Design a protein around this nucleic acid. Structure first.
Ligand SMILES: [K+]
Ligand SMILES: [K+]
Ligand SMILES: [Mg+2]
Ligand SMILES: [Mg+2]
Ligand SMILES: [Mg+2]
Ligand SMILES: [Mg+2]
Ligand SMILES: [Mg+2]
Ligand SMILES: [Mg+2]
Ligand SMILES: [Mg+2]
Ligand SMILES: [Mg+2]
Ligand SMILES: [Mg+2]
Ligand SMILES: [Mg+2]
Ligand SMILES: [Mg+2]
Ligand SMILES: [Mg+2]
Ligand SMILES: [Mg+2]
Ligand SMILES: [Mg+2]
Ligand SMILES: [Mg+2]
Ligand SMILES: [Mg+2]
Ligand SMILES: [Mg+2]
Ligand SMILES: [Mg+2]
Ligand SMILES: [Mg+2]
Ligand SMILES: [Mg+2]
Ligand SMILES: [Mg+2]
Ligand SMILES: [Mg+2]
Ligand code: NA
Ligand code: NA
Ligand code: NA
Ligand SMILES: [Zn+2]
Lengths: 75, 56, 212, 103, 107
RNA sequence: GGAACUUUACCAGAUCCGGACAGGAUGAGGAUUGACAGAUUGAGUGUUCUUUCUCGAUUCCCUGAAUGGUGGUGCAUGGCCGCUUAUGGUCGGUGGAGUGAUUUGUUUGGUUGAUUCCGUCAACGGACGAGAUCCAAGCUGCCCAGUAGAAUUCAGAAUUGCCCAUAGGAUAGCGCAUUCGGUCGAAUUCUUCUCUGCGGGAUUCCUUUGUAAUUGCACAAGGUGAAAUUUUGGGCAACAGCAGGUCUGUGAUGCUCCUCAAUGUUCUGGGCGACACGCGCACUACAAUGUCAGUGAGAACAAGAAAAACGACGUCGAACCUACUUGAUCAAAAGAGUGGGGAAACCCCGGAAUCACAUAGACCCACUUGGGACCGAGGAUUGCAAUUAUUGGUCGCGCAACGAGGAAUGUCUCGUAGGCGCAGCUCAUCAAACUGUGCCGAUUACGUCCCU
């Protein structure tokens, strides 16, 4: 037996893990658009998934061209 | 993700955890005869309304 | 395929019990005394019995339409298949449900338990009841709980005929100290048509016809 | 001779089911249709036995709750319009009347 | 499983809540609630509906009743007043429970 | 409360906010949400991290607050239940008695299970309980059947008289010989059996050279009868109480505790099962009034499938239970195919087990063909998951006790005890439990206050 529903307050070996926050990208549309004097070009490729908003720009991570919705990675 | 893991075992819908009292949501001592799905304590309080009576 | 007869009556009873509980919780301030329904090929025709007929109705039927929408959404009734009606209780004092709710309201108004219970007993007997019994239990005087019973007139307890001759109701009272249980039992008088009685003499009463 | 229509009357109330059956029979006799006979099917008793206590203390006492189901059937050789006319009246609450065509 | 209710779902529940003055939802944390709007069908998670109604109740925009694992939420006068302002509905618009009755609910 | 996960309240860990709302700080090219891949990790878990996308005013951010809790306290409570207590008990009004607490009523006596009655009476009138009422069973009337059955008459079939066994006893037949629920015949007629909503029927009714009575209330034997005393078995059940149980039934609840590395809520794993031992309650036995292997005749109460889901084009159609066939040119358990049933309709003419058999069957008093505990190996089945055997089936193990059980101790008086199975209930899978049901069916007493 033991104390009924009591806060033992044990000691944690692993340090407390932080909480994830959105990484701000200032002027994301500025980096996506490539306005050559004016013909605006899309540096990121348009989505190849019609159901997942056909035309939404994918990511440009090193060696990965995934999208946010369809998650159709290119590598 | 966390949404995929959230209540994944409950989504299976088998065993006592799937079932509950239709009146009080308790999962203990459920009467499943005639598909009543009412816990015994709730059934005693609501027996007359359902139509049952205490004969012999 | 179609449900068996056993399953059908079980479904009807469960629906009635749910409907009764919903109406009792909703129309607590009104003297909700019972509910009946009659399913036909056209509609459902739920009839609600209450004492404060205008209060449950609302203005232009606003509340009764709200109740109809609640029942229709809960049980997935199609359009033009559910209809609600409000009927007034013939005698307020002979309904145990109405009196116990009134006693609950009196106790929440911070009144003396003895005075409130005697007032309920008085009104019940002026209504024409053969007897009335009121029970109040819980933390009344102090920390130590106690139960007091107030009686007047006739009241039968044993057998099976007491179920037909006695109307009973119990309610919870939520006070600052805790829960208070109120019970009202009314020995209904004989009625010709059974609207306010069982329409039968007591099981142990024998009457000898006066010769002509 | 003609098509046969089956009236199935079921109710939890014995008095209600009997009154509906009598009213249906009387209306059929008024319409002069050939009825076979009101057959009283066996009464079915739904039994639920539960422990009285809500906690499991003391002598293990039990509650036997019973629900009785009454069923009647009436056979008559009448056109569907005539059976609809016979059936069209005010029934008691809690009584179920079903229409079946025999083949 | 999330209470992050999308805005399009919010006004869809809001549109139903104005058309029919009450909303009934079973207290199942893994079920889906179905409405009608004006003839179509839309489904929104019950957890999102309960979160929206809890916000309305905390603001005193609705009245809440509960019985047999089912919620019943009903809009009061403040609720409909806020309801019209949010939806930008035409003035004097009233729910089905407040439109002209012409129906006798007596006996 | 028969827990593999869930239940679950416990343990070792990781998730989510399911902290509404209000006020602040922040915030449009961004308040936030959600994630590819690699690595962190038990987690091809965006949990967190690197990297970027995506979301969008839904949310963070912090202060109060709020919320949830099978957290405490049943010695703060409601409700319910158990017990006091299965017996006959309980209380006013007015009147009598007492300074008063209180008493009388509510009693000498007899009778009754009964404070049930008669009778008496400083009490008189009442109220509850008891009785009555209610449910079920036994007999019976009306009604009634194409969801129950029966009997005749024509057809269609089968046995058919000389037969006496391996040794073949006992046991009714002495105008027309029997048999055929597949003969998936055809006509008639009917309500003996069955179904059941209301009725009937039993009450001390009848009779004693009876007990009593000199009055009554009644009792005992027999009669009548399906039933002869509360007909039988249940349900209900007063008034006073208990610091009985339950905060592990509820959106029943005061006070109190935790509340974003939580006592909330999920997910993973383990535990609730863990054994030198003690105790309650069961199951199986110790064998011949038996065990095996055959064969026969034969119950009752009961259960059975699903939607604001999904597939098909506002209706079926698959979840449930079953019958038949197949598997089968070769074990069981399986696996399949087809058909039926919403349940008096299919299961089903419900082939239950005790039981019976002149079965000319095996065993022959022994831990033995008694007893199957423990254990090994193959295979199948339920489940998302079977290891700590889920559960059947097969062959082994039977050298595990146990040969009738010390002191003590439980229940029981008629279709009862005891035995014997069956159904329901828990249930995806699993009854040595419980709730009911029928089958086979006694010994003893019908008495007492010795024990309690
Ligand atoms: K006095
Ligand atoms: K074996
Ligand atoms: Mg009485
Ligand atoms: Mg009685
Ligand atoms: Mg188990
Ligand atoms: Mg577990
Ligand atoms: Mg766990
Ligand atoms: Mg939040
Ligand atoms: Mg918890
Ligand atoms: Mg709780
Ligand atoms: Mg207590
Ligand atoms: Mg208590
Ligand atoms: Mg305790
Ligand atoms: Mg006295
Ligand atoms: Mg105690
Ligand atoms: Mg508490
Ligand atoms: Mg245990
Ligand atoms: Mg034998
Ligand atoms: Mg053996
Ligand atoms: Mg597992
Ligand atoms: Mg095996
Ligand atoms: Mg042996
Ligand atoms: Mg058990
Ligand atoms: Mg004694
Ligand atoms: Na007195
Ligand atoms: Na006789
Ligand atoms: Na429960
Ligand atoms: Zn319940």
């Amino acid at each position: 037996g033991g104390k009924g529903k009591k806060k033992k307050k044990r000691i944690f070996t692993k340090p407390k893990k932080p909480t994830h926050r959105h990484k701000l990208e200032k002027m994301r549309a500025l980096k996506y658009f490539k306005v050559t004097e004016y013909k605006v070009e899309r540096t990121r490729q348009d989505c190849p998934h019609p159901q997942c908003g056909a035309g939404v720009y994918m990511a440009q991570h090193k060696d990965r061209q995934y999208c946010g919705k369809c998650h159709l990675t290119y590598k | 993700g966390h949404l995929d893991q959230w209540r994944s075992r409950q989504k299976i819908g088998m065993g006592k955890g799937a079932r509950c009292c239709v009146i009080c949501s308790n999962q203990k001592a459920l009467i499943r005869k005639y598909e009543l799905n009412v816990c015994r304590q709730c059934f005693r309080e609501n027996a007359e309304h359902i139509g049952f009576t205490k004969l012999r | 395929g179609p449900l068996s007869k056993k399953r059908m009556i079980i479904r009807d009873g469960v629906f009635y019990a749910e409907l009764f509980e919903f109406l009792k919780r909703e129309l607590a301030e009104e003297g909700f005394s019972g509910v009946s329904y009659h399913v036909t090929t056209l509609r459902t025709e739920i009839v609600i019995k209450a004492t404060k007929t205008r209060e449950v109705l609302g203005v232009n039927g606003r509340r009764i339409r709200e109740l109809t929408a609640c029942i229709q959404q809960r049980f997935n009734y199609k359009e033009g298949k559910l209809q609600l009606y409000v009927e007034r209780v013939e005698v307020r004092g002979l309904s145990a449900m109405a009196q116990v709710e009134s006693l609950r309201f009196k106790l929440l108004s911070n009144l003396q338990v003895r005075r409130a219970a005697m007032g309920i007993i008085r009104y019940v007997m002026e209504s024409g009841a053969k007897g009335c019994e009121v029970t109040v239990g819980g933390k009344i005087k102090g920390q130590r709980a106690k139960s007091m019973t107030f009686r007047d007139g006739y009241m039968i307890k044993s057998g099976t005929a007491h179920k037909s001759f006695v109307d009973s109701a119990c309610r919870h009272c939520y006070m600052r100290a805790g829960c208070i249980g109120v019970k009202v039992k009314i020995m209904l008088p004989g009625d010709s048509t059974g609207r306010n009685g069982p329409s039968e003499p007591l099981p142990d009463v024998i009457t000898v016809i006066e010769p002509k | 001779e003609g098509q046969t229509v089956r009236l199935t009357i079921t109710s939890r109330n014995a008095k209600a089911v009997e009154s509906v059956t009598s009213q249906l029979l009387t209306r059929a006799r008024d319409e002069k249709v050939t009825i076979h006979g009101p057959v009283r099917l066996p009464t079915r008793t739904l039994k639920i036995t539960t422990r009285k206590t809500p906690c499991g203390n003391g002598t293990n006492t039990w509650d036997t709750f019973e629900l009785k189901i009454y069923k009647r059937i009436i056979d008559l050789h009448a056109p569907t319009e005539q059976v609809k006319k016979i059936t069209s009246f005010t029934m008691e609450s809690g009584v179920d009347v079903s229409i079946t065509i025999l083949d | 499983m999330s209470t992050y209710v999308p805005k399009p779902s919010r006004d869809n529940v809001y549109r139903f809540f104005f058309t029919e003055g009450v909303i009934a939802c079973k207290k199942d944390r893994m079920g889906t609630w179905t409405g009608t709007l004006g003839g179509n069908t839309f489904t929104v998670p019950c957890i999102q509906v309960m979160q929206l109604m809890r916000s309305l109740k905390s603001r005193n925009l609705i009245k809440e009743q509960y019985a047999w694992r089912h919620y019943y939420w009903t809009l009061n006068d403040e609720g409909i007043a806020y309801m019209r302002s949010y939806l930008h509905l035409a003035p004097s618009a009233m729910p089905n429970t407040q439109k002209p009755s012409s129906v006798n609910f007596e006996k």
